[PDB]
Each structure stands twice: as structure tokens, then as C-alpha cells.
């Protein structure tokens, strides 16, 4: 029952990091221009990429039982992402018009589910990690 925040940190990081941004980005979103936003979102999406790989390393980090769910969760996050990425690709063009705050708001919405999505990700894992704790700790 030590602090195994070694590799679980990398996994728990992306999740948070991306999340912490999902929100923050929302704040600096309104202002964030179409030149600084295009990437902004691109970043969140980029993080996912690495996150996926990170998960693979986390897969084992957790006890057998939170595999499928985890896998299904990955697609879950991406989902919102994909829809989030598109939202941007549009906002980028639906900003110079005038109905920015409108479309921009939409993004926020996802940001809400996103934060959760990312949560439900580890949330499940958290249920696994324990599955190991209260069972038979090896190392």
C-alpha cells in the first residue's frame, strides 16, 4: 500500500492534464483566436493519442477486471474528442462570422461530459486498483 504513483502518474496525468485543459481551455477559449484555437483543441486530441498508449501501459497497472470497460472507455473519450475536434474545425470558421459565442458554447458542453469521460476512465480503473489492494498485494 505504498505510493505507486510512478507509471500510474503518466496515465493519471494525461487524463487530468487533458481534463484540466478541457476546462481551462474553455476559459481561454472565448478569447483564444482561430489561430490559437485550431491547435488548442488539436492538443487535447494529441494528448489522447499518447493517452491511449499510456493506457496500454496502465492496462496491466490495474488488476484484471477493468479491461473491457477500460477499452470501451477509451472509445468513449475519443468519441467526445472526435466530436470535439469537429466542433473546433467548425468554430474556426463559425467564429469570424459572429455566432461564435454560440458555437463556442457548444464546445463547453462537451468539456463538461469530457471531464467526466476522462473521469469515468480512471474512475473505473480506480475500482480495479483497489480490486488488487484488498486481495493480495505482491510488491
UniProtKB/Swiss-Prot annotation:
PTM note: Phosphorylated on tyrosine residues upon activation, e.g. upon integrin signaling. Isoform 2 is phosphorylated on serine or threonine residues, but apparently not on tyrosine residues.
Annotated transmembrane regions: none
Positions of post-translational Phosphotyrosine modification: 12
Any coiled-coil regions, as ranges: none
Disulfide bonds: none
Localization in the cell: Cell junction, Focal adhesion; Cell membrane; Cytoplasm, Perinuclear region; Cytoplasm, Cell cortex
Free-text comment on this protein's domains from its UniProt entry: The C-terminal region is the site of focal adhesion targeting (FAT) sequence which mediates the localization of FAK1 to focal adhesions.
Free-text function comment from the UniProt entry: Non-receptor protein-tyrosine kinase that plays an essential role in regulating cell migration, adhesion, spreading, reorganization of the actin cytoskeleton, formation and disassembly of focal adhesions and cell protrusions, cell cycle progression, cell proliferation and apoptosis. Required for early embryonic development, embryonic angiogenesis, normal cardiomyocyte migration and proliferation, and normal heart development. Regulates axon growth and neuronal cell migration, axon branching and synapse formation; required for normal development of the nervous system.
Family per similarity comment: Belongs to the protein kinase superfamily. Tyr protein kinase family. FAK subfamily.
Complex and partners: Interacts with ARHGAP26, GRB7, DCC, PIK3R1, PXN and SRC. Interacts with the ARP2/3 complex.
Protein name, as recorded: Focal adhesion kinase 1
Organism: Gallus gallus (Chicken)
UniProt lineage: Eukaryota, Metazoa, Chordata, Craniata, Vertebrata
Entire protein: shown range: 916 to 1053 of 1053
Amino acid at each position: 500500500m505504498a505510493n505507486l504513483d510512478r507509471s500510474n502518474d503518466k496515465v493519471y496525468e494525461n487524463v487530468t492534464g487533458l481534463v484540466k485543459a478541457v476546462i481551462e481551455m474553455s476559459s481561454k477559449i472565448q478569447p483564444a483566436p482561430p489561430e490559437e484555437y485550431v491547435p488548442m483543441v488539436k492538443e487535447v486530441g494529441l494528448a489522447l493519442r499518447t493517452l491511449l498508449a499510456t493506457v496500454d501501459e496502465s492496462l496491466p497497472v490495474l488488476p484484471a477486471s477493468t479491461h473491457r470497460e477500460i477499452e470501451m472507455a477509451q472509445k468513449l473519450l475519443n468519441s467526445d474528442l472526435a466530436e470535439l475536434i469537429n466542433k473546433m474545425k467548425l468554430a474556426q470558421q463559425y467564429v469570424m462570422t459572429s455566432l461564435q459565442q454560440e458555437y463556442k458554447k457548444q464546445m463547453l458542453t462537451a468539456a463538461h461530459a469530457l471531464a467526466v469521460d476522462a473521469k469515468n476512465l480512471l474512475d473505473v480503473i480506480d475500482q480495479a486498483r483497489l480490486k488488487m489492494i484488498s486481495q493480495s498485494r505482491p510488491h
